[PDB]
Amino acid sequence: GGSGAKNSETAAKVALMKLKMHADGDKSLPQTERIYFQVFLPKGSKEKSKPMFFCHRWSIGKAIDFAASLARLKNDNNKFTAKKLRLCHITSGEALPLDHTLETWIAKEDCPLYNGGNIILEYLNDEEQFCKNVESYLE
């Protein structure tokens, strides 16, 4: 295709539905309780971030520990004496608690993370609340 790329509302809807289909999972599935999330790779050359299928009824922190297994990636989170892979906002460092669930925040008044959003995974201690700047690493 070409002709640049116009900007409109429909473009977001089509792009969203098209992305969910690419996300690691089933397209035919109802995905009524499960939502797709864009995880930012640490050193993803070809791609900066990859979509992943997650459940709304899953701990925010645990979501990472699980995704690491399903994706078959290397990371020391099961232990305690070692940095654990966790999700946090880009250019913020603020890392939500693992006891909190996605549906909880999404359903809550705040609702910081919305459907089709983006998130990055970095090695951060459980006790650690605010991590360094991720942008610095991807600079």
CATH number of the domain bearing residue 100: 3.10.20.90
- Closest Cα partner for 73 from 31, 113, 118, 43? 43
What is the chain's alpha carbon radius of gyration, rounded to the nearest angstrom? 16
CA-closest candidate to residue 25, choices 61, 50, 42: 50
C-alpha distance from residue 91 to each of 42, 67, 97, 102 (Å) = 15, 22, 18, 20
Is residue 1 assigned to a domain?
A: no
φ/ψ bin of 50: left (φ > 0), alpha (ψ from -120 to 50), beta (otherwise):
beta
Contact of 65 with 77, CB cutoff 8 Å: yes
Residue 14 covered by a domain: yes
Domain that holds residue 127: 9-137
Residue with tokens 């109802």: 30
Look at residue 41 and tell me if it is in a domain.
yes
Q: Is 4 inside a domain boundary?
A: no
The answer to whether residue 3 is domain-embedded is no
Q: Name the nearest CA neighbour of 25 among 48, 49, 51.
A: 51
- Alpha-helical (H) ranges within 41-112 are 60-70, 102-107
- Nearest-CA neighbor of 67 among 32, 97, 36, 99? 36
How do 34-40 and 49-55 pair as beta strands? Answer: antiparallel
Q: Quote the tokens at residue 27.
A: 């397209």
Place of tokens 């930012």: 40
User: For the chain, what is the domain count?
Assistant: 1
Structural domain contains residue 88: yes
Asked if residue 35 is part of any domain, the answer here is yes
Residue 26 inside a domain? The answer is yes
Structure tokens at 61: 């922190």
